[PDB]
Write a protein that binds this ligand. Structure first.
Ligand SMILES: *[C@@H]1O[C@H](CO)[C@@H](O[C@@H]2O[C@H](CO)[C@@H](O[C@@H]3O[C@H](CO[C@H]4O[C@H](CO[C@H]5O[C@H](CO)[C@@H](O)[C@H](O)[C@@H]5O)[C@@H](O)[C@H](O[C@H]5O[C@H](CO)[C@@H](O)[C@H](O)[C@@H]5O)[C@@H]4O)[C@@H](O)[C@H](O[C@H]4O[C@H](CO)[C@@H](O)[C@H](O)[C@@H]4O[C@H]4O[C@H](CO)[C@@H](O)[C@H](O)[C@@H]4O[C@H]4O[C@H](CO)[C@@H](O)[C@H](O)[C@@H]4O)[C@@H]3O)[C@H](O)[C@H]2NC(C)=O)[C@H](O)[C@H]1NC(C)=O
Ligand SMILES: CCCCCCCC(=O)OC[C@H](COP(=O)(O)O[C@@H]1[C@H](O)[C@H](O)[C@@H](OP(=O)(O)O)[C@H](OP(=O)(O)O)[C@H]1O)OC(=O)CCCCCCC
Ligand SMILES: CCCCCCCC(=O)OC[C@H](COP(=O)(O)O[C@@H]1[C@H](O)[C@H](O)[C@@H](OP(=O)(O)O)[C@H](OP(=O)(O)O)[C@H]1O)OC(=O)CCCCCCC
Ligand SMILES: CCOC(=O)c1ncn2c1CN(C)C(=O)c1cc(N=[N+]=[N-])ccc1-2
Ligand SMILES: CCCCCCCCCC
Ligand SMILES: [Cl-]
Ligand SMILES: [Cl-]
Ligand SMILES: [Cl-]
Lengths: 343, 329, 334, 123, 345, 334
């Protein structure tokens, strides 16, 4: 009875087309984010998903009410007749407002006139990733939001608490498979545009890719293939079919490994750290068979050494290759791993 | 104060009527800010672009005398006033943004000037000519116009600072690099009438870093690797045969990735020409030994290895000269 | 002012539930199509996606106005207050009207009462495809336009500008197909219950063979020729002829396995499967040839028709039978 | 081996009620249509009831409203509650299970069958 | 015009669309029939199929009687939404579409008697569970079940308009299947009990048989030829150690290439299908042929082969002689048993 | 009789305020919930989610909707739910859910004379399940569904499973392709916060993956290749062509198995149990080929300056160590 009377007399003379304090002050909106789940990061789309409880609070003098209760609760129909901030995500791609089984929104009005607007959102935001150090790369995915139509002089956004404590990520919410969430940086700023200056609230979620999968799928098979190609250096020079098959099949193995490695990586047109490692391994396996061609060119006798005439001596090229090839590959690995793991 | 102004503007206002209907064409000044040009899907012949699209026009029905010089409004009044029916002609799929509210802006000045902006994600059609792939350049257009109002009713015009781009390094151009921007205006005749069509051209050039490491270098080495048999003695029949046939198998494996990201075009691309020629060279290397083995052992041909030691490396080097000079210069 | 009075008068008392000439002759609706693009011709899904400007023309005397020498183009929202034909596409899997920046809809009123109604539609129309001759197949995909709730007593369809109603077909470029021709058919589907109008737009798409020559046929032909090289290799070289014979079999398998992934998943026998399987038999029989040669010399040798005769006979029959296989294959499918 | 064993049933005074059960083993029939068939002596094999994975209960016109079929998907069994017994119901009651290809009322569409159970309604 | 407009305005007077016709008095009976315009593609990966139908429903609402020159009315979408219609839903429907291009593909006609005929054009994506143990020689009966969502058997009952077999009609060019052949449909009705009550369900099973020709050329023939190829090495001389060693491993690699590609054609089931056993048996034969040579090579004394002109030479291996008969016969026995079993099913 | 029902229904909704919950100034409204799981499908490891279609029923008593004189349960039209108060229940882990709308929206409202309201909904929900796949494919997963009120605490609303542990039905009828539902569990609890306690209902399943698919497709082919690499140990040391070709082809075959299983298996970018086994077999075939190089070097490199002993030692250690590797692997994961 008394509750119903209060609800009907709130919107009498209320104009939702006008922000609170229009021509009198600047509408201050206090926002805090509760990240329930940092959703999957899509490298192929340069986007990340995030499920949040986006909360916004502001004061509207026009909605003051005197009554038995201090907090009112509005249905979605009545909440659509009240001015709300036009907050949008600058880097959002396709965000979803959940509607099961009802609209996942809640508007509360206090007696003083303070509104609490909370909604459950699935935000797909753009994360520009420079994959040149893949898979040993780290990315700082941003989350920028602010008012679309109201400039800095009309609506200002602030964090409800200290910026560090305003954005809260659930302790058991990480939905990341190939990434580790290293924390977030919370800040606010001003962006100047052709439609005026706006207040932008930014959050930078820092991520580091986990390298364990690529070590056992890409690096280890490639390293063992290079070792296998260098194994043929210890075979006798007279076994021409054996070392020839040893060379091409290792090259074919490197081709198989290189093709599968690039399939998982998103189709960038530039070279990543994994591409250079495979290219060097490809050259080492290629050089192993070229070395045998030079060795075979100086083999005088086709017959091999017997168990007990003149026999071929061990190639000096082979002896130097048994040291140069393992050393040069070992040097490359130390240069490669120290260059990228240190970053 | 503002409430009375807003009510009077809509008092006796017919949003079904274009401003200056029956008087003169409605001039609409259009701006555009490109947030990011998304991926260029060559298979579907399309690309994604995210823009802030701004339109400005004068509506004398929205004049108001007041101390307030401009009404900075949200999307609430968008459906109450006349809005241009601007659509993107090459758009395969376009979306507006509605999180957390309709991503739209409406600003009205006291002299009747209206500023209406919205945020749009567009999957615009772009027919790519991939004859020079992966050394090809494209100019993907973004065409828009009115849907029902011909040139006698709505005329679009670019401002001087119309199309503005941001960082251009945050864009999702994995395969391409943004090199330039062009804005044009034209009139297109249809069955309905003559329409003013505004076009924005984005010039993109593909980056060849991935194709060099993954396609050109591995194919080049295999061709060189097939030349090893020329220095192997002709008595080593199992060695030269296995070397010749395994390189062909390896070359076939690499031919899988030659045409992977691009659609099933029926014209020869630059990459397909290089891979096919490399396949012929490794094909001829095995055939060269088959002819040498038959005449020497199975009954000048006997000096074919000496000729192959020079002819094959020279022919492939000459091919690389013609191939790379033609496509890169 | 006067235009506003005219438009308000037209919509005042207008009954959207009644078609033009409700108690009289059927309303004649003219249709023309401007095809923006055709894409996503899916063999797997047996459908194609088409974007078009679909325009409908009809006369409504309730919407006739005098004194204004202009054709009134109104806001697209006025289409909800007017009667429009209940046109639908019979073979439409999924279609939508584009809605950026507004609903891509046009209403243009003419002083005699004629209504021009335009829609920008992207439709996924379904066509049954016979792919037994793939990739040497010519498809024919149609678009059926029909009235859902009216018969020929109430509504009639025709192509406005009969042979030139559909435009933009010549400007369509398809990476895989070539549009040989398009046809326009206007007919009344006669039933005992009633006759229903229908407009039919059909295209004949011819698949381009240039892609498959370089990707499928030429790789298979060259590998088959390589299997013949073992015929000229001496019968003593067991490790050479076997390695050449079995690697070409493996190479043919690699081509077939790769093509099974890069080509649309069409689970029935096609022309492309017959040629790949035919080339697989030739490289399989070429490897069986050496086994017969090896068994004759080493198995039936000591017992003691000619080892060199089999190789020499195979150097002619295998190239001849393969060329004969190509002649029968290409003539039957081209 | 897959075995269907009809349990329960026998001679019953007219007006009684019999719950014929059918345990299954060797294959879980949660995705199969379990049905009950009846074969009068010398006449034919008659479909009585069927229940599929979606718990849809199909009944023959001669036994509709009298017999109730139920399935215990956890126990992999099907039950037939016989009510309103009449002397014309004296036959062998069979338990079947199949995918219902061309069927769900045809005996040939069931691959798994029980040994049968003689239910005699003597009066 | 005036008479027609008068009836439309008068019909809705005193009408409550929240109540079914005959509420508290009788049972609302709905006559249903289906015209299948196109039986769309069947997805084995999702175990679902698409079907395009014209769904026709007919019931009696005495509240909508009228008298006038016409005998059958025609209501627009706005007026049809103000009248009670059955809440028919598809029990196994996953995500269906009601077409509205260019206008809502619906039609409601009212006879002066009060009979309502409701037609709508729908695309239904139903779920079709499959027993893939006999793949690719399997056959499925894909169901299409529908009924009232809210009203139990005591409130709304569904019946087929004509005889049940004739109430579901498939267009002669409707079949849009690539890997299946639609053999026919059986039409039936049943009863389901749930936590909310007992409901009438109308069912239609579409019987599909999978085409086997594709898998024979792509999978069965290459596997059979690979197994034959492995047994071919038994006819090579035992002194060709590199030749027969290359023969054994490369046929195993060939089987691996064929086995991987064949598996991609089927969704991830957790049981061995008919094609899975064929590949495994073919894999065993190729594997065992290489093991056989290792035993033959272990007893080869001399490393030189017999020369044409003729020293002592190796005799033909008894293991080779026995394998030239045993291996081809065992594979032939497996093929006859395998094809007799599954093709008869 | 129907006229009397119509009078009652209009009387109930006259003056009804949807914005207020039942017993607004009194005890919390107790909402009883049952779920009829029609099906569970698309248990995805890549997306860490599962899809289920269910009949979601909610029961509560509203004295404003109690009626007398009608011994029937008033099942109203589904659109009457917009004119009644319904709980604001949502799913926490839900990623994308919808209510089916063919032919109409799949919801029901059934009123009872005592005032009980039955609110039914047919919902397909894609809920999120974080899966620990380190034991894949020998892993058991735990998929939950969390139901909560958006804006009501335990002071205003309360949740309970109607029927106890029999609230959720249809779990026994679910047949998953690659999973087995070991058990399902129902949890009713209040999430206590500083502001207040929030009711929550949890429905959790325990899925156990079936190993039959992976045994015949992943494990057995790798075992056979590893055994084939041991054939080289029974070949004479001088047969360089035979032993190297066999050894290097088994390395290639293992790579082919691993690279293709990478595409076939779900893209899970971290170490799993299957990855350990495949890498273990790859090392064994790597050492077998490396074993011959040691044998070859001993005879030919250190010769002029027992190879049979090395082969004899390899014929025992390799089968034994691989069997030891299998025993440790299966015991740790099974
Ligand atoms: C065949 O059937 C299908 C299915 O029914 C039809 O598809 C439907 O088409 C209709 C008509 O176009 C749409 O209605 C409008 O929708 C827009 C867009 O918002 C909705 O849709 C968004 C997604 O759309 C995108 O994807 C779909 C595919 O999924 C695609 O089809 C579409 O083209 C587009 O690409 C949703 O994201 C959005 O959800 C968000 O908002 C919800 C609340 O609205 C909220 O619950 C969600 O959580 C989420 O936040 C939403 O569903 C609406 O904007 C639009 O509403 C405005 O315009 C209509 C015009 O008639 C007007 O009546 C409304 O009152 C409203 O206009 C007011 O607000 C404007 C914006 O603020 C303002 O500018 C106006 O001035 C006006 O404001 C005035 O009134 C308000 C009070 O109302 C007052 O406060 C102000 O002060 C002022 O006085 C329509 O609802 C359907 O959405 C669409 N549905 C689907 C599933 O596609 C299809 O068209 C049919 N085809 C044929 C040929 O018949
Ligand atoms: C990729 C390698 C490119 C090499 C390019 C350069 C290739 C190049 O110049 O080879 C010549 C020589 C080959 O030496 P290698 O030991 O292979 O061959 C011996 C050499 O030919 C002797 O001269 C022969 O004896 P003789 O005097 O006739 O009695 C001897 O015959 P025999 O004992 O059987 O009777 C042969 O075995 O190599 C080097 O000295 C190392 C060069 C640097 C090697 C650097 C390796 C990294
Ligand atoms: C998978 C195969 C498993 C086989 C397992 C069983 C393996 C097993 O037991 O091998 C021994 C033997 C090998 O016989 P095989 O013909 O290969 O070898 C001959 C044999 O060793 C004679 O004894 C030698 O003669 P002798 O010393 O001078 O008098 C002769 O020397 P030569 O004439 O060159 O001078 C050798 O060539 O095999 C069988 O007898 C067939 C058994 C059944 C084989 C069933 C095969 C299906
Ligand atoms: C084509 C001209 O642009 C426009 O008409 C336009 N439309 C919206 N916005 C702009 C201006 N601009 C480029 C924006 O990036 C923009 C940033 C904001 N920051 N906040 N919070 C808020 C609004 C912004
Ligand atoms: C018919 C094509 C045969 C190709 C054989 C290549 C070697 C020829 C040696 C004379
Ligand atoms: Cl991730
Ligand atoms: Cl790109
Ligand atoms: Cl199909």
């Amino acid at each position: 009875t008394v509750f119903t009377r209060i609800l009907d007399r709130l919107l009498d003379g209320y104009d939702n087309r006008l922000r609170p304090g229009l021509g009198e002050r600047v509408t201050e909106v206090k926002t805090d984010i509760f990240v329930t789940s940092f959703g999957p990061v899509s490298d192929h789309d340069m986007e990340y998903t995030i499920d949040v409880f986006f909360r916004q609070s502001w004061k509207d003098e026009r909605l003051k009410f005197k009554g038995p209760m201090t907090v009112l609760r509005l249905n979605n129909l009545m909440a659509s007749k009240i001015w709300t901030p036009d907050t949008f995500f600058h880097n959002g791609k396709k965000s979803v407002a959940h509607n099961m089984t009802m609209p996942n929104k809640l508007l509360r009005i206090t007696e003083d006139g303070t509104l609490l607007y909370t909604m459950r959102l699935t935000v797909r935001a753009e994360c520009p990733m420079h994959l040149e150090d893949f898979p040993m790369d780290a990315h700082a995915c941003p989350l920028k939001f602010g008012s679309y139509a109201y400039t800095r002089a009309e609506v200002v956004y602030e964090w409800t608490r200290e910026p560090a404590r305003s954005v809260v990520v659930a302790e058991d919410g990480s939905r990341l498979n190939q990434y580790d969430l290293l924390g977030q940086t919370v800040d606010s700023g001003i962006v100047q545009s052709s439609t005026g200056e706006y207040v932008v609230m930014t959050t930078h979620f820092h991520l580091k890719r986990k390298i364990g999968y690529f070590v056992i799928q890409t690096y280890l098979p490639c390293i063992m293939t290079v070792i296998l190609s260098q194994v043929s250096f210890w075979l006798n020079r007279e076994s021409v079919p054996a070392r020839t098959v040893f060379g091409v099949t290792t090259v074919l193995t490197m081709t198989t490994l290189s093709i599968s490695a690039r399939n998982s990586l998103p189709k960038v047109a530039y070279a990543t750290a994994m591409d250079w490692f495979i290219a060097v391994c490809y050259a080492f396996v290629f050089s192993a068979l070229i070395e045998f061609a030079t060795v075979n060119y100086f083999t005088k006798r086709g017959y091999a050494w017997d168990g007990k005439k003149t026999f071929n001596s061990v190639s000096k090229i082979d002896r130097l290759s048994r040291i140069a090839f393992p050393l040069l590959f070992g040097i490359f690995n130390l240069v490669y791993w120290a260059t990228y793991l240190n970053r | 104060d503002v409430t009375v102004i807003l009510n009077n503007l809509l008092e006796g206002y017919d949003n079904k009527l274009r401003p200056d209907i029956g008087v003169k064409p409605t001039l609409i000044h259009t701006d555009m800010y490109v947030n990011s040009i998304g991926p260029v899907n060559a298979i579907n012949m399309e690309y994604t672009i995210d823009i802030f699209f701004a339109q400005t026009w004068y509506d004398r029905r929205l004049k108001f005398n007041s101390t307030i010089k401009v009404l900075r409004l949200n999307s609430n009044m968008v459906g109450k006033i006349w809005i241009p029916d601007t659509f993107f002609r090459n758009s395969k799929k376009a979306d507006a943004h509605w999180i957390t509210t309709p991503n739209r802006m409406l600003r009205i000045w006291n002299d009747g000037r209206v500023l209406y902006t919205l945020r749009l994600t567009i999957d615009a059609e772009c027919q790519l000519q991939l004859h020079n792939f992966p050394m090809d350049e494209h100019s993907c257009p973004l065409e828009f116009s009115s849907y029902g109002y011909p040139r006698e009713e709505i005329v679009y015009q670019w401002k001087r600072s119309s199309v503005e781009v941001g960082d251009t390094r945050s864009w999702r151009l994995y395969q391409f690099s943004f090199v330039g921007l062009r804005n044009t205006t034209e009139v297109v005749k249809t069955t309905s009438g003559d329409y003013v069509v505004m076009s924005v051209y984005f010039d993109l050039s593909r980056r060849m870093g991935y194709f060099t490491i993954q396609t050109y270098i591995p194919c080049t080495l295999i061709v060189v690797l097939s030349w090893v048999s020329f220095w192997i003695n002709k008595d080593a029949v199992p060695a030269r045969t296995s070397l010749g046939i395994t390189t062909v198998l390896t070359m076939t494996t690499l031919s899988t990735i030659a045409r992977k990201s691009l659609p099933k075009v029926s014209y020869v691309t630059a990459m397909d020409l290089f891979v096919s020629v490399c396949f012929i060279f490794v094909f001829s290397a095995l055939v060269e030994y088959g002819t040498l083995h038959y005449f020497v052992s199975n009954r000048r041909i006997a000096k074919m290895d000496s000729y192959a030691r020079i002819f094959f490396p020279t022919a492939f080097c000459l091919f690389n000269l013609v191939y790379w000079v033609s496509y890169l210069y | 002012s006067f235009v506003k009075e005219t438009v308000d008068k037209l919509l005042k008392g207008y009954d959207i539930r009644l078609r033009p000439d409700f108690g009289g002759p059927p309303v004649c609706v003219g249709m023309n199509i401007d095809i923006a693009s055709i894409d996503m011709v899916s063999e797997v899904n047996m459908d194609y996606t088409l974007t078009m400007y679909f325009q409908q023309y009809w006369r409504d005397k309730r919407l006739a106005y005098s004194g204004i020498p202009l054709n009134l183009t109104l806001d697209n929202r006025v289409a909800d207050q007017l009667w429009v034909p209940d046109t639908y596409f019979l073979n439409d899997k999924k279609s939508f009207v584009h809605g950026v920046t507004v609903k891509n809809r046009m209403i243009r009123l003419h002083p005699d009462g004629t209504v021009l109604y335009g829609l920008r539609i992207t439709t996924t129309a379904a066509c049954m495809m016979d792919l037994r001759r793939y990739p040497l197949d010519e498809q024919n995909c149609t678009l059926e336009i029909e009235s859902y709730g009216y018969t020929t007593d109430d509504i009639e369809f025709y192509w406005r500008g009969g042979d030139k109603a559909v435009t933009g077909v010549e400007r369509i470029e398809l990476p895989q197909f070539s549009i040989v021709e398009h046809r326009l058919v206007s007919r009344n589907v006669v039933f005992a219950t009633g006759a229903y109008p229908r407009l039919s737009l059909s295209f004949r798409l011819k698949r381009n063979i240039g892609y498959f020559i370089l990707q499928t046929y030429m790789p298979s032909i060259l590998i088959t020729i390589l299997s013949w090289v073992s015929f000229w290799i001496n019968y003593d070289a067991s490790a050479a002829r076997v390695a050449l014979g079995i690697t070409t079999v493996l190479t043919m398998t690699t081509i077939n396995t790769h093509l099974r992934e890069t080509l649309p998943k069409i689970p029935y026998v096609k022309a492309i499967d017959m040629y790949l399987m035919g080339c697989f038999v030739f490289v399989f029989l070429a490897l069986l040839e050496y086994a017969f040669v090896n068994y004759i010399f080493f198995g039936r040798g000591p017992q003691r028709t000619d080892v060199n005769a089999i190789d020499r006979w195979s150097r002619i029959v295998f190239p001849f039978t393969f060329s004969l296989f190509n002649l029968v294959y290409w003539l039957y499918y081209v | 081996q897959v075995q269907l064993q009809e349990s329960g049933g026998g001679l019953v005074q007219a007006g009684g009620s019999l719950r014929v059960s059918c345990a299954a083993s060797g294959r879980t029939f949660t995705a199969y249509i379990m049905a009950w068939f009846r074969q009068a002596p010398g006449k034919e094999r008659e479909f009585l009831a069927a229940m599929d994975q979606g718990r849809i209960q199909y009944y023959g016109d001669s036994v509709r409203g009298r017999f109730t079929i139920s399935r215990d998907y956890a126990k992999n069994s099907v039950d037939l509650q016989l009510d309103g017994l009449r002397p014309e119901d004296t036959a062998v009651y069979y338990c079947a299970a199949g995918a219902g290809f061309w069927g769900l009322r045809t005996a040939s569409s069931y691959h798994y069958w029980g040994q049968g159970t003689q239910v005699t309604v003597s009066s």
